[PDB]
Amino acid sequence: LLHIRDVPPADQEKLFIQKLRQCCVLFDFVSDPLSDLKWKEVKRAALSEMVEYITHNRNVITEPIYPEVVHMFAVNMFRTLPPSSNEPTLEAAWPHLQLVYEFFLRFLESPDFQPNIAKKYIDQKFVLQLLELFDSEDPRERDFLKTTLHRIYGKFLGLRAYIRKQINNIFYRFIYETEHHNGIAELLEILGSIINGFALPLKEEHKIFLLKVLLPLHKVKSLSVYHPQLAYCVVQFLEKDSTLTEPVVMALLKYWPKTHSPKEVMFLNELEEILDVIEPSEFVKIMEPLFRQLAK
Amino acid sequence: LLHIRDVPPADQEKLFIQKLRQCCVLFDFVSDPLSDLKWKEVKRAALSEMVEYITHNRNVITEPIYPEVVHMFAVNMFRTLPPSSNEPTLEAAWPHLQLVYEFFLRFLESPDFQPNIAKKYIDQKFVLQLLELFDSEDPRERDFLKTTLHRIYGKFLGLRAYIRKQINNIFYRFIYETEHHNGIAELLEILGSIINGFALPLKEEHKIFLLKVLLPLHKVKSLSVYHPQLAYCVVQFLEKDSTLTEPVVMALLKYWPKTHSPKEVMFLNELEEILDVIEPSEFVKIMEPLFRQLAK
Amino acid sequence: SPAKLHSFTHCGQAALTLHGATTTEALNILHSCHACRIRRGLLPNHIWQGDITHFKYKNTLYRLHVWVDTFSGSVSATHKKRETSSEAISSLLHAIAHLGRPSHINTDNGPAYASQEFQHACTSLAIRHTTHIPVERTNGILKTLLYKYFSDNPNLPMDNALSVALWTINHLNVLTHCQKTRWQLHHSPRLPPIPEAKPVTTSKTHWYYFKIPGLNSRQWKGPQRALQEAAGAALIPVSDTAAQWIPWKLLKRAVCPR
Amino acid sequence: SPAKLHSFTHCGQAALTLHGATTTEALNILHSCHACRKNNPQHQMPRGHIRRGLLPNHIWQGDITHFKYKNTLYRLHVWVDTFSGSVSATHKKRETSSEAISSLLHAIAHLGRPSHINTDNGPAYASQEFQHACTSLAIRHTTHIPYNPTSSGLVERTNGILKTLLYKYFSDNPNLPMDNALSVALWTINHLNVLTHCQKTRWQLHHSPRLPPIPEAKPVTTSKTHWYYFKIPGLNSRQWKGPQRALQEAAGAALIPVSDTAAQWIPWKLLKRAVCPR
Amino acid sequence: SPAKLHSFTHCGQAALTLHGATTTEALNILHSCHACRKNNPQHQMPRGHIRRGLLPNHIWQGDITHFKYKNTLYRLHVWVDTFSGSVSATHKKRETSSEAISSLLHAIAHLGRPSHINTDNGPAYASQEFQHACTSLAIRHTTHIPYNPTSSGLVERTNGILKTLLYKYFSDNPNLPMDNALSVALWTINHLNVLTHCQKTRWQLHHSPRLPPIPEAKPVTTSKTHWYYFKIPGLNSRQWKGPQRALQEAAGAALIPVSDTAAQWIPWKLLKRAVCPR
Amino acid sequence: SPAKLHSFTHCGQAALTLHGATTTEALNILHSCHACRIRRGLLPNHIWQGDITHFKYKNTLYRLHVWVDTFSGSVSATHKKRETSSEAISSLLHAIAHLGRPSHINTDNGPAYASQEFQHACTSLAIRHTTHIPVERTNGILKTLLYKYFSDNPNLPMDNALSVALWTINHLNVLTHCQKTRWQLHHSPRLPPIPEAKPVTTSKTHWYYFKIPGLNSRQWKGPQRALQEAAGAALIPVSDTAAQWIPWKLLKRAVCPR
DNA sequence: GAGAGAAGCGCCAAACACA
DNA sequence: ACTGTGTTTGGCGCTTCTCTC
DNA sequence: GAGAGAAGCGCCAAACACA
DNA sequence: ACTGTGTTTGGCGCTTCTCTC
Ligand SMILES: [Zn+2]
Ligand SMILES: [Zn+2]
Ligand SMILES: [Zn+2]
Ligand SMILES: [Zn+2]
């Protein structure tokens, strides 16, 4: 077609629209490594030029632009996940997907983006489809999803408790029904970033959250991979109120494997920080049972 | 009394008034060289401080100030002239008179002086009394009178032709009735400064002036003392119109002393400049009679 | 070029994939070269671990002081000709200059790390120092890379080799689990906190009067908005077609137009 | 007449109107005289600014500096990034090409690999060893105009800052070792101090999200030339030289034939506009 | 803690708030540190202006200058009036007290008699012959601070103007004699050129109506003293000295004890404010 | 003091009357000292007259070149060791530097004043030069004053004496007819012309924003009016009580308030 | 009880030195 | 390509707070 | 004929050098 | 008392005038 910048301003936005519709055509890299190379290069160049153009000019976004880019993201990204195989496997369609992710991030974080126009274009279905992606076998995609969901949850105010309840349901399903999940560290990092922003006094829903879905996450076999994020979340949580620590102690003093195992080091390291932070302001309520069960 | 500046502003002008009335008391230096030295020093100090104060502050002059200072000048200056005696004699009352002259000059040339308030306080009698002073035997007083009358004639517009006619009468009286006059050079300098400011074409009154009162002034015995000013006036006059020179030539070619005398050098010097300026633009009308009478 | 890049640094294959090299080109170059054929911390700069090492030279010895971050694995190493508490302090400070200030430091007992000099160095920076007696993997990685670099060129001053090894293992080798370099993982910014019951707002930047470089003009032309900022410049859209980097000497702050 | 009065006395402008002349004509009379423009040291030319990167690790500036400590004359080799301002510095005993190579590799290990580096025309930065080292890493090496110490303003200002911090440190502990002081200074500058105008540390800029791409550039220059009085940058003199005509001129300098056999590059600070003789 | 962090690293202000501190407290922490004020070359003091006359022929400034012409080194003795700016200048072969006396008498014959003359502390202006000559005419002779060449700004600027005019003249006629050139320059400067801001020639000001009298003055000075870091005007150094307390201070300078045995006068350009230790 | 003033310059009595001395004190001092007991031009700088003079010294000779203004009598003299057209040109230029540019110059014929060098000097300045062959009074006055100055002190370098004589007869001796010094008469301004049928207006000066010296302030405080102006200063009434001389670096022009 | 002093806080132009 | 810059420092406006009639 | 280009004129901030 | 300053130079607004639709 044309470069998006070399046109008179009047119809300029129009051309942008066409460029988006020039990127919704699919090309499959896993079907065969060599197919439609010219069209693939055209798509890559178009995505690169659009992401370059979107971050240097103000007042380019307009009303008839939001649903089109939402649809483009939903077409390029929302898809069935590849068959599982447990160095990790890497998505073969990564160039175009990376370009789309960067485009969406730069768009959502523009200063001209209005936080009241996606309340009729980004609804609970968008959040559901974007949150079912955290089971990707590629870590770069998970990182991009984390840094996108953070911006979404920050900017919007009607999707907060919805996302929290959905995450609670995800945690329940992973802990009990199916044990095949690989995004339990990025979700935990987002959770910690959310938890640090509470006010006083703590709501009771957060206490239910801590006692029901954070602590039992210890009894899984594969806790070793995402231990740092969980420990960070716990230590960051219990600072807002120093009295609500005792349930954490008496819950950690049960899920401890009472036999010999290599998994002890995680519990010792976490207890180190929890004890460092709990010591001030007369904490001896459970020190005796803690040390008793620790001597074992 | 007090210093004029060390008082609150409200009554400040009032004190100034009193100071002026502290200077209208007369002290006579010619009566005896040593009399009322304390009061004379007080008068001198008061005049000095007032002239110092009048030239550093704006909006000090007010409506009830003009006639008082006019009266002070008329009391200190307007007086009978000392007896005549033909190095020249010097006024013995010169300190206070110099202070008064400087005060009046600084006052009249202030930027706050309004040129429409002395049309009811400075009238033809003021001009007459100030113009009868040019017969003073002291040259400093004549210089001050010249530089004061210049400012007066410049600032006022209703006293111009009056002063010109009065000067014509003075010239007639000096040339014919009485030959005792000593201010015929400062008056001529003022006249030249006035003459240089004409417009085109020349009025006929100015031609009458040139032909009747400037040219005959040559036939006096004491022309040698004020020859430069007269020659300058003539050469400055005849530049505005180059055709009105012939009467000057045929009038200068008569009053020439046809005998041998030391007075020839003045006529030769004046003819030098008149011929230098008249030569351009075909001047041979009277060249032959001029050279004929010159060969003698 | 990947060929020269490997011939200089002996980096990995997943590293060469990031550059112009592709999967099978990287696999070809890797074995065509002769000589080639848990985490305790919670945040970057939370806990370090400090070792020492004898590196054997054919006519002398080197004492390597190595600190490792126990959340990303960022290595900082220094080579000395002896080992005392003075040189332990020097190594810790040279590491702080590279990585930042640790909160908690952990090291083995010995003549150094246990005197009053080292404890007085650690107490002026608010770094708590725990001692324990019996990571060792990164030490071996660094030693093998030194061996390779000396194998290719024997006339290396031991100061170039250490810097090239640190460059390779910090900025070039890609970790296998998260596909990130140690440097990238160690210096990527954390997520900002989120105020509750308060909309997370976008930051609004300032408005400037500006002038064009190389024009000698003397008139500030219109208040605009700054898009990006750096040291000694600012990205200003002079028109609605192009944007230019204006130095700070040609910029003057203003107030919103309203 | 104005022209002969000035040709005799070289008076000013406000003098030639007081002898009969329009203001513009006196202005032309002054602007045309060559003895009055060859000798007036006042000129008016635009100001130049150094080249800066479009993103971190694009352009670096390097330098060396002396430091007198405990009767020893240390040589500090300094390398500073132009986008963010991050500094790296190592102390050596003397100046040689080997020291330059080792210092550059220290800098690369600390910051990353730069695309272009530009330093002055020293005797250890133009050597064959240094050129071979730069080509071994795919690093372009340009130089500046000889005898123009203001073309490396950033790295010289950084030398000043670094030495000031070192003096503040040595004021307290006159027995402090040198490497400890340099390391503390580097930590302070890169991590603790905040830049004046953007209000972010050098580290936060160096490790910011690179997501903003490079704005496109344009190599189009001005297509016309003029006449210039000039001074040779090495030696300063009382009066200008010339005028001559520029062969070409880019932003910040101009190409002036100093002699008839060879030309030279002169910055916009030793040039003065002249009048076209035709 | 802020105080120990600064006591270790000497970081800035925007760094101490990011570790817990009010802005004013960080400002006090910085303004109190003596190692950071002893070493920062930046200061902020008021500017001084030379003493000027209240009417023509009240205060003069005098000087000598070299001029290289035809392998000879002429000494131009220059005397400039401060009210109007009128200049007088004579060329001599060498510097001696007799030459100074003759040049001063030339100046008096050309301009008139001055009340006060102030020159630098030269070896020919402080001699007994010159003092006796000045006392023979009732002329007060004061001096300036040694090694402060900006206290005679007017006469130095006049030397510059005079030499520039001489060079413009010698550009045209390289065989022109010296006295002719000096005389033409003096005529041009005093009679033909117009001052920049008042738009009158130096001669018109020198021979204006003296009728405006002298405004009254006040010798009242400031009654309080402070503490100052200082530099000795002769020798420049990296770091300030002190602090000390001023004995007295008039507009444009201050009295600082350089040593314990003797004090000295230092201008408001080599002084930096300090904090009161009590 | 009049006593020292006469003992140094041997000025007249009407001069000493201007100073602290009075009539009878001047008459006492005048004869208590041992060694003491028409106009052709029309304006200042209209016609000059140039002479030459041999001044006899006991072991050498001096050639005095003297120009006199034929409207005030202002003397300008120079002493040389020879006499040529070069030195005539030097004398004329040294006189122009003191008095101004003459319009018409008149001098006696001779080896100088009649060559091509002097005529070429006079033609580049637009000064017409008339030659005549046969004032002499001022020459004698200057010679007698030189004699007196040498009589009091014999060790005078002839350069101080000439300058002191010129100072005396130009700035100290009072003319008898008009009670003015030669300098005062020669440099007093003429009267401005008067436009006819047009009121001669007072000149209105400009308004300035100002700052106080020695205060380091950074705020321009109110537009005022300048009373008097000089080189490198201006008289500004800071209040309605006192007025101060503000340099030009602390003044900024404004526009009338209306 | 209320309107004025007092302290806190940001912003800015002029200097300065590395060469 | 070739090309000065970053930091310090008192003053001043502008917002918030506290001691007195 | 009329409103826009073109030339004249004043004013000003930034440099520069004498030491 | 002790104490930097005066001149040059292109750019820019602001007033007056002239060549074209
Ligand atoms: Zn290899
Ligand atoms: Zn010229
Ligand atoms: Zn400090
Ligand atoms: Zn005598």
Numbering used by the authors:
A (entry chain F), B (entry chain C): 27 to 112, 124 to 333
C (entry chain D), F (entry chain A): 3 to 39, 52 to 148, 157 to 280
D (entry chain E), E (entry chain B): 3 to 280
Reported in the publication:
IN first catalyses 3′-processing of the vDNA ends, exposing reactive 3′ OH nucleophile groups that it uses to attack a pair of phosphodiester bonds within target DNA (tDNA), resulting in strand transfer. In this work, we determine the three-dimensional structure of the deltaretroviral intasome and characterize its interactions with its host factor, the PP2A-B56γ subunit. The deltaretroviral IN host cofactor B56γ14, as part of the heterotrimeric protein phosphatase 2A (PP2A) holoenzyme, interacts with a number of chromatin-associated proteins and potently stimulates concerted integration activity of deltaretroviral INs14.
To aid stable intasome formation without altering IN, we constructed a LEDGF/ΔIBD-B56γ chimera containing the DNA-binding region of LEDGF (residues 1–324) and B56γ (residues 11–380). The STLV-1 intasome structure revealed a tetrameric assembly of IN subunits organised around the vDNA ends, with all domains of the tetramer resolved in the cryo-EM map. All four SLiM regions in the IN tetramer participate in host factor binding, creating two distinct binding sites for each of the two intasome-recruited B56γ subunits. Thus, the virus uses a remarkable strategy, exploiting the oligomeric assembly of the intasome, to bind a host factor at two separate sites by means of the same intrinsically disordered yet highly conserved region, located on neighbouring IN protomers. In the cryo-EM map, the STLV-1 IN CCD-CTD linker exists in an extended coil conformation providing ample scope for synaptic CTD positioning in cis.
